[PDB]
């Protein structure tokens, strides 16, 4: 079947964007709930007294569409762990304003990015939001397999990429996730949205994500190769990981622009659906155990109790 979603940071008109995305075959849309560039001031005059609606109306979609088709995204300027106090304070207020608006809309999930080592204040703001009312909506933490600092081109002459194998260092993004969830005291509402890079890390790095609550896998269009016919495809190494992720039954997210411009955008999803269709079948045990995955039970006592 495979559950799929489209990631965008540009939604000029919400109605047609959703419509166009649905027409491509996608089950949901990851989009900003406030304009990603619309930086807001909460303390200083005259900018704090900016008028007009702060974002688009909830009336633009049906309650069911908000609840089932939209995954919210935190604004890229919201930096709760900034070393600048003024930025930190506006970002706390903005994070709450955005997370509260998502709650108002009844959004099923909301995306937050783990793009650096220190996300302590981001963790604090999110734990205070979790402990303010109900416990429905999911929080998808956007964390890459390989840190952006470790996948940059070796094009800076006076700052070369480290050619020393750092076993623990290649696993830095897991510790960013681990620290955050440890701080938020293992909240069941906090999961992983794992971002796949152009070059897959060493197997050990991939294996670290075993046992972790992966609810989404983010596939950029830029990681796709081009086959003879000019269609987007993946390396055999990338395919292997997709098959492992399909055993976890994750939701797949396609991010980025069309890099195969001569073809329709849906070709990226068509490929994904093909890998989903061409996966090994469930054996007698895998068929029987279906529905019992990580379901805890009391061990049976046929001596003390009559079965």
């Amino acid at each position: 079947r495979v559950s799929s979603g489209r990631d965008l940071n540009c939604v000029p008109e919400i109605a047609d964007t959703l419509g166009a995305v649905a027409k491509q075959g996608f089950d949901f849309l990851c989009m900003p709930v406030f304009h990603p560039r619309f930086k807001r001031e909460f303390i200083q005059e005259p900018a704090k007294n900016r008028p007009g609606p702060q974002t688009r109306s909830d009336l633009l979609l049906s309650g069911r569409d908000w609840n089932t088709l939209i995954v919210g995204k935190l604004s890229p300027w919201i930096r709760p762990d900034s070393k600048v106090e003024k930025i930190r304070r506006n970002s706390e207020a903005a994070m709450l304003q955005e997370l509260n608006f998502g709650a108002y809309l009844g959004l099923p999930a909301f995306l937050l990015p783990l793009n650096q080592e220190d996300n302590t204040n981001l963790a604090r703001v999110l734990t205070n939001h979790i402990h303010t009312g109900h416990h429905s909506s999911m929080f998808w933490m956007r964390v890459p397999l390989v840190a952006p600092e470790d996948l940059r081109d070796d094009i800076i002459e006076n700052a070369p990429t480290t050619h020393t194998e750092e076993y623990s260092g290649e696993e830095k993004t897991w510790m960013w996730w681990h620290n955050f969830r440890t701080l938020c005291d293992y909240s069941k509402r906090i999961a992983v949205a794992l971002e796949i890079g152009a070059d897959l890390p060493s197997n050990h790095v991939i294996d670290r994500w075993l046992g972790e609550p992966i609810k989404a896998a983010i596939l950029p269009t830029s990681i796709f190769l081009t086959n003879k016919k000019g269609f987007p495809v993946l390396s055999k190494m990338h395919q292997r990981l997709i098959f492992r992720l399909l055993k976890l039954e994750v939701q797949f997210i396609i991010t980025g622009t069309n890099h195969h411009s001569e073809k329709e955008f849906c070709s990226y999803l068509q490929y994904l659906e093909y890998l989903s269709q061409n996966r090994p079948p469930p054996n007698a045990y895998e068929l029987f155990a279906k529905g019992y995955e990580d379901y805890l039970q009391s061990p049976l006592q046929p001596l003390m109790d009559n079965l």
């Binding site: 007009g52 609606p53 702060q54 974002t55 688009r56 109306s57 909830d58 009336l59 309650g63 908000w66 609840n67 304003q97 509260n100 608006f101 709650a103 108002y104 809309l105 009844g106």
Partner: protein, 318 residues
Amino acid sequence: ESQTYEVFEKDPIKYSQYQQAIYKCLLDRVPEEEKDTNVQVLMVLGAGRGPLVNASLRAAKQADRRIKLYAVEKNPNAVVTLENWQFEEWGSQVTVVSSDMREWVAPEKADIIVSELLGSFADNELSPECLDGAQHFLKDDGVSIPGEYTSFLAPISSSKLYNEVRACREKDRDPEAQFEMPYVVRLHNFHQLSAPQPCFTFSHPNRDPMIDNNRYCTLEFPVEVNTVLHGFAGYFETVLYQDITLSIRPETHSPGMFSWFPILFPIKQPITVREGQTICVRFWRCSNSKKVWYEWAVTAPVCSAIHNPTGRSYTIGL
């Protein structure tokens, strides 16, 4: 949430009643000679997503009178709905105010203040406190819609509901906390043991020097059957304007109005009642700096413990 406002808006009976009450009040404030010469300052206090703003506009057009609207809303999320409605449809006629009605510094005084801050037990959403704060910016001769509300109580027998309440015991809290708090519930499998009697009444505006929203009420319920008392069902009635009312009291229930289900005040221990005996209950509306709450006790045929003392199990945040 947006979905909670969407379900309030699904009740047409409520807003058609509000529109009618505003229309009737407009004709009593502006006579046909002053028709389009005098403009009435109307303030919707707790405007939500704006259905009351639209009701006030439909009323001014049907009455053929001039109105200047203010839409006061504390919820910033609902303010986004309001500010988008304002810009797209309402225009300069409607001024959207993102403020708590108690904190708001008004530019003008109001002729009419329109609000829907009522719970299933009328005052349990703290309509009195909210409207008392906002009272200062109403003109001396000013009208509040609603003008009055009254809560009602009746003793009930229901072993199913007693079992349901019991099942609300939670870890990390008093093992009997569940009995010291009201529940909004569509009462089905129950028995009313006596007729509903008025409990607490509030009137707006509150023209008295020492304004006190605290109350103590004693209710005597004649019982003509042998039975077991499991709690008290709560309802309300309100006067929007003159004969324009809204009621959830079963005997006078507004037809087709599903905006409020009844409330249930449980009792920790079931009380046996014999035919000819009177059930006597005492209810208190209490408050401090930061919270408001109810306390209750049964004194006849036997005593119960005072339920929710100091709001230890249930409070309404100010």
